[PDB]
């Protein structure tokens, strides 16, 4: 029973670590995209450049 409890605790810790990893990487991607968009808008670059970057990133709604 004690080994079973330890295994269950380890699996729960694994699930928590996976959840935290997912949330942290989601936050990192959000921050990166927000910074990219802010640096894109602050300058007066031609919209072609931002369209090209959006095409290269492959984030088109599907």
């Amino acid at each position: 029973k004690k080994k079973d409890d330890e295994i269950q605790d380890l699996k729960r810790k694994i699930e928590e670590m996976s959840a935290e990893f997912a949330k942290m990487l989601k936050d990192t991607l959000d921050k990166m995209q927000e910074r990219i968009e802010m640096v894109q808008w602050d300058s007066d670059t031609d919209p072609q450049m931002m369209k090209r970057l959006k095409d290269m990133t492959g984030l088109s709604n599907n």
Copy 2:
């Protein structure tokens, strides 16, 4: 013995996942820095803005 072996396997998986998550964070940060540097260098922003951004990011080497 089998429960101990499964505990060992769970610990091995946990450590491997931690290592891969840390390496993925490092790769994401490196790519973000590379892209930000490229965007800053392509434009003619005053070095003051880059210095201010570096100060804000809190990445001063010790």
